[PDB]
Amino acid sequence: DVSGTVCLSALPPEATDTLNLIASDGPFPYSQDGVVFQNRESVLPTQSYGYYHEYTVITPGARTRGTRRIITGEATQEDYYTGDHYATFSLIDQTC
Amino acid sequence: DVSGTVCLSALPPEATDTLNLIASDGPFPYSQDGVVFQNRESVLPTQSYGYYHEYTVITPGARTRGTRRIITGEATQEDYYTGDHYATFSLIDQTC
Numbered sequence: 751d752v753s754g755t756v757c758l759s760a761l762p763p764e765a766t767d768t769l770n771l772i773a774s775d776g777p778f779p780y781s782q783d784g785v786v787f788q789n790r791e792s793v794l795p796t797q798s799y800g801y802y803h804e805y806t807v808i809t810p811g812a813r814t815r816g817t818r819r820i821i822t823g824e825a826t827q828e829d830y831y832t833g834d835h836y837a838t839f840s841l842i843d844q845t846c
Numbered sequence: 847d848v849s850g851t852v853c854l855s856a857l858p859p860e861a862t863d864t865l866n867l868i869a870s871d872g873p874f875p876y877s878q879d880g881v882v883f884q885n886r887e888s889v890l891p892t893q894s895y896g897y898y899h900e901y902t903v904i905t906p907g908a909r910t911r912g913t914r915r916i917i918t919g920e921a922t923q924e925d926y927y928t929g930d931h932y933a934t935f936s937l938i939d940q941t942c
Contacts (some may be wrong), residue, residue, distance in 0.1 A: 841906075
């Protein structure tokens with residue numbers, strides 16, 4: 751289940767950075783940016799393989815890619831944030 | 847993010863000195879000159895560890911290393927100036 755909606759303004763600023771890169775199709779900072787997200791644990795609605803893609807949201811100060819991601823679906827503005835390495839997701843509302 | 851490009855001629859003269867030392871591979875005045883800059887806060891573009899190195903830009907009169915630096919990247923002509931101890935950066939344009 752998607753745990754609600756979150757305003758874009760409420761997320762870390764790097765989430766805005768990631769969305770702006772998704773809009774331009776990159777170039778992306780990481781080679782893993784834009785891979786398919788398999789939705790293994792069925793947290794997001796079930797779709798055919800390839801429907802969802804994942805992108806890094808940089809965490810300043812982290813030594814790795816960290817745990818923050820944006821997952822896109824194919825519908826307009828269907829963008830989900832996770833800050834906990836895919837345990838929970840929120841739909842992003844870009845209007846607030 | 848990088849805050850734009852600045853001509854070398856518009857930076858303190860000490861920045862020209864530091865760039866000349868980088869071109870000759872030293873000798874450098876400070877022991878810390880040439881160490882890797884980790885880019886921990888993700889202000890500069892994400893790159894592999896060791897892509898960036900740091901060099902002192904002397905501040906006249908200072909007893910310490912002060913707050914001015916050049917950060918080199920591995921690409922041709924990729925040099926960044928900070929006058930505020932890594933909070934902000936500008937790309938240096940050696941052509942002007």
